[PDB]
Amino acid sequence: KSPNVLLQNLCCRILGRSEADVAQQFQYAVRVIGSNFAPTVERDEFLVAEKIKKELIRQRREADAALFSELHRKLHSQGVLKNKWSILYLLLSLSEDPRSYATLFAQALPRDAHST
Amino acid sequence: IRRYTDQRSLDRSFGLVGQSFCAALHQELREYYRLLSVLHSQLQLT
Amino acid sequence: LVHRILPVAASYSAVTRFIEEKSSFEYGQVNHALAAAMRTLVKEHLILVSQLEQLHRQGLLSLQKLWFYIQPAMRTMDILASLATSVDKGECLGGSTLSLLHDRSFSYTGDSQAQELCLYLTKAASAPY
Amino acid sequence: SITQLFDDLCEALLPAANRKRAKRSLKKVAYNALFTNLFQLPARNKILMLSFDLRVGGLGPKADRLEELVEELEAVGSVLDLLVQLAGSGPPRDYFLNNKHVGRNVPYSGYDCDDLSVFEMDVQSLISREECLCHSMIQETLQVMEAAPGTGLPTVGL
Amino acid sequence: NLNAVRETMDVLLEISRILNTGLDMETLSICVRLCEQGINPEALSSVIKELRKATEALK
Amino acid sequence: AAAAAANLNAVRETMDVLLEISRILNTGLDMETLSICVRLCEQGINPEALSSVIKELRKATEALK
């Protein structure tokens, strides 16, 4: 597929309803995926690996934090994914705690100090 | 701009609103360095 | 230009010597708890230089990029070294260095970069008391 | 009838210069292609995918205008379905955007300097035209000054 | 009412202009009245593209 | 041929590894939605953009229930 029909498939995945019914949300999605689409900042998977470790330390779970290391190794052992940074950032952002802040914690470089 | 920041950050009685003024002289120095980075990247031409 | 960049390394060494020496039981549980929270920021200092290593390996970094990149963490380590020197000079332990931190918390308010930092350090060190 | 209006459509795509009898024969190719389809997702999502195709290529307010114009078009329904099929079938600045010296209550964002680089392309496009002109005048004369004689004149060829 | 159906067709003209069709004002008026009869637009997409090609063989 | 199925195997492994990652952080998404997300991430996309969309679209289905 192309991305433009694929965002519709996402709109049909999470909502049960038809795509001729809900088109306001698909319209709101198309604005935000468009015009901020492709990577424009520097990708680094190691910082995201350490932040998946910091999330699993935030649960105080050290065993899966060591399981994540061999999974993170296996992702590079196969090497059939174009953006390793994206899916780990994505999955880290979508975490849910069964049962902080980030103005002291330093992120990636934006390539706004570097020419595009 | 920078001599004043060099003085006020080593002046230990300048208040906390004069030391907020001097923090508005920190933001526009860090932005200056961002600009200079953009310049240097485009030199790797006159 | 190199001379301008040199003071932050002294403001690293002063911090790590503090973290070694004043975590001992002669210096009290609140200094233990404070050194346990400044330990996190040393790790966060390692965080940046790893990414910068990755970029320098990729055939690209200059001194002017570097100088800009290290500015937000340049202020932090300055605050850390000053605070550790202040705790050393009075030999503050126990409740004296909850008096000092109660003062320092009001002392830094401006720019709000350091306000979060000192607030986290005083909330972290205050548990045993 | 409608069979006359297909020939009017046949008259529109013909520019004026036989030549009314070529028309009635092109009318047959129009009928032979009308029944090829007859032999062998609402409207508004199709607007969203092309608005997306715009927005990835930059130029955000232009998508924001196309959606506003089809909004009052959704307030005749069969003709936009034709318009989504034809796309590229034809022929193959203001100082209130990137300026803060003017405005009334102008906001602040500091410098961007990544549209200043597309403000140098704003000059490179002007230079690419006025170099294409000097490419299109030395060629149209070298094609006539170089040949055997009698290639620019039809009357010598008789 | 003929002023309203005029302004809506004018709005119809511009969104087919920036999508860069070859249809002009009169071809759009023809196509709108042909679609109003009940003619399938999916076939009109074929007959216009064939007619514009066969026109160039005459010139 | 055969190598065109061997690479299908080499991605069939990775789709399990990302599934284990996804479940130990526990998204409220399953394998089929995740296939749309990996299809999106192959062409190149910002997770800061996509994740916000997912946070909005989940607040559209319990507003019609």
Swiss-Prot record, chain A:
<comment type="function">
    <text>Component of the gamma-tubulin ring complex (gTuRC) which mediates microtubule nucleation. The gTuRC regulates the minus-end nucleation of alpha-beta tubulin heterodimers that grow into microtubule protafilaments, a critical step in centrosome duplication and spindle formation.</text>
</comment>
<feature type="modified residue" description="Phosphoserine">
    <location>
        <position position="100"/>
    </location>
</feature>
<comment type="subunit">
    <text>Component of the gamma-tubulin ring complex (gTuRC) consisting of TUBGCP2, TUBGCP3, TUBGCP4, TUBGCP5 and TUBGCP6 and gamma-tubulin TUBG1 or TUBG2. TUBGCP2, TUBGCP3, TUBGCP4, TUBGCP5 and TUBGCP6 assemble in a 5:5:2:1:1 stoichiometry; each is associated with a gamma-tubulin, thereby arranging 14 gamma-tubulins in a helical manner. Gamma-tubulin at the first position is blocked by TUBGCP3 at the last position, allowing 13 protafilaments to grow into a microtubule.</text>
</comment>
<protein>
    <recommendedName>
        <fullName>Gamma-tubulin complex component 3</fullName>
    </recommendedName>
</protein>
<comment type="similarity">
    <text>Belongs to the TUBGCP family.</text>
</comment>
Curated annotation (Swiss-Prot), chain B:
<comment type="similarity">
    <text>Belongs to the TUBGCP family.</text>
</comment>
<protein>
    <recommendedName>
        <fullName>Gamma-tubulin complex component 3</fullName>
    </recommendedName>
</protein>
<comment type="function">
    <text>Component of the gamma-tubulin ring complex (gTuRC) which mediates microtubule nucleation. The gTuRC regulates the minus-end nucleation of alpha-beta tubulin heterodimers that grow into microtubule protafilaments, a critical step in centrosome duplication and spindle formation.</text>
</comment>
<comment type="subunit">
    <text>Component of the gamma-tubulin ring complex (gTuRC) consisting of TUBGCP2, TUBGCP3, TUBGCP4, TUBGCP5 and TUBGCP6 and gamma-tubulin TUBG1 or TUBG2. TUBGCP2, TUBGCP3, TUBGCP4, TUBGCP5 and TUBGCP6 assemble in a 5:5:2:1:1 stoichiometry; each is associated with a gamma-tubulin, thereby arranging 14 gamma-tubulins in a helical manner. Gamma-tubulin at the first position is blocked by TUBGCP3 at the last position, allowing 13 protafilaments to grow into a microtubule.</text>
</comment>
Swiss-Prot record, chain D:
<comment type="function">
    <text>Component of the gamma-tubulin ring complex (gTuRC) which mediates microtubule nucleation. The gTuRC regulates the minus-end nucleation of alpha-beta tubulin heterodimers that grow into microtubule protafilaments, a critical step in centrosome duplication and spindle formation.</text>
</comment>
<protein>
    <recommendedName>
        <fullName>Gamma-tubulin complex component 6</fullName>
    </recommendedName>
</protein>
<comment type="subunit">
    <text>Component of the gamma-tubulin ring complex (gTuRC) consisting of TUBGCP2, TUBGCP3, TUBGCP4, TUBGCP5 and TUBGCP6 and gamma-tubulin TUBG1 or TUBG2. TUBGCP2, TUBGCP3, TUBGCP4, TUBGCP5 and TUBGCP6 assemble in a 5:5:2:1:1 stoichiometry; each is associated with a gamma-tubulin, thereby arranging 14 gamma-tubulins in a helical manner. Gamma-tubulin at the first position is blocked by TUBGCP3 at the last position, allowing 13 protafilaments to grow into a microtubule.</text>
</comment>
<comment type="similarity">
    <text>Belongs to the TUBGCP family.</text>
</comment>
Swiss-Prot record, chain F:
<comment type="function">
    <text>Required for the recruitment and the assembly of the gamma-tubulin ring complex (gTuRC) at the centrosome. The gTuRC regulates the minus-end nucleation of alpha-beta tubulin heterodimers that grow into microtubule protafilaments, a critical step in centrosome duplication and spindle formation.</text>
</comment>
<dbReference type="GO" id="GO:0031021">
    <property type="term" value="C:interphase microtubule organizing center"/>
</dbReference>
<dbReference type="GO" id="GO:0005813">
    <property type="term" value="C:centrosome"/>
</dbReference>
<keyword id="KW-0963">Cytoplasm</keyword>
<dbReference type="GO" id="GO:0005829">
    <property type="term" value="C:cytosol"/>
</dbReference>
<comment type="similarity">
    <text>Belongs to the MOZART1 family.</text>
</comment>
<dbReference type="GO" id="GO:0051415">
    <property type="term" value="P:microtubule nucleation by interphase microtubule organizing center"/>
</dbReference>
<dbReference type="GO" id="GO:0005819">
    <property type="term" value="C:spindle"/>
</dbReference>
<dbReference type="GO" id="GO:0000931">
    <property type="term" value="C:gamma-tubulin ring complex"/>
</dbReference>
<keyword id="KW-0206">Cytoskeleton</keyword>
<dbReference type="GO" id="GO:0090307">
    <property type="term" value="P:mitotic spindle assembly"/>
</dbReference>
<comment type="subunit">
    <text>Associates with the gamma-tubulin ring complex (gTuRC) consisting of TUBGCP2, TUBGCP3, TUBGCP4, TUBGCP5 and TUBGCP6 and gamma-tubulin TUBG1 or TUBG2; within the complex, interacts with TUBGCP3 and TUBGCP6 to form a luminal bridge with actin that stabilizes the initial structure during complex assembly. Interacts with TUBG1.</text>
</comment>
